Swiss-Prot record:
It comes from the Bacteria. It comes from Bradyrhizobium diazoefficiens (strain JCM 10833 / BCRC 13528 / IAM 13628 / NBRC 14792 / USDA 110). Heme binds at residue 47. Residues 1-55 form the PAS domain. This is Sensor protein FixL. Residues 56-106 form the PAC domain. Putative oxygen sensor; modulates the activity of FixJ, a transcriptional activator of nitrogen fixation fixK gene. FixL probably acts as a kinase that phosphorylates FixJ. The chain holds residues 154 to 259 of 505 of the full protein.
């Protein structure tokens, strides 16, 4: 339902309408920010590493695999969500697409 697209450095490039309702940020506020603003520690402080790691090893842990994780809303509250992630190229640069499913109220 909710879709988020980030660039190779973790910066949000697209934030769908459902994502706004789910995380509390507006599309304009979300775009330009690191995707780690949507998660609690320790993932938050480590997410950039996860991405760099994947980019240098090309060994997926979540891409094409999926996982249930905890996200964080604008107000600071945490919730369960399923995440599916894909990768694609545009203009020779990588972009990651994420499908987010809220398990708090599906
Ligand atoms: C908001 C909650 C999110 C959490 C808690 C989270 C958590 C994580 C975790 C735990 C890993 C590494 C897993 C491991 O090493 O075992 C990871 C990897 C990754 N995440 Fe996230 N993530 C979140 C959102 C996103 C979104 C929205 C995208 C993309 C639009 C994204 C893209 C990636 C990428 C590219 C990787 C590396 C790919 C891989 O290792 O398969 N993440 N994330
Ligand atoms: Cl999946
Ligand atoms: Na912005
Ligand atoms: Na899975």
């Amino acid at each position: 339902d909710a879709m988020i697209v980030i660039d190779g450095h973790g910066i949000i490039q697209l934030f769908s309408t459902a994502a706004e309702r789910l995380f509390g940020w507006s599309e304009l506020e979300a775009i330009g920010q690191n995707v780690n603003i949507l998660m609690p520690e320790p993932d938050r402080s480590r997410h950039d590493s996860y991405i760099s790691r994947y980019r240098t090893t090309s060994d997926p842990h979540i891409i094409g695999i999926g996982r249930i994780v905890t996200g964080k809303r604008r107000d600071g509250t945490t919730f369960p969500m399923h995440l599916s992630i894909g990768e694609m190229q545009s203009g020779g640069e990588p972009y990651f697409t994420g499908f987010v499913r809220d398990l708090t109220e599906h």
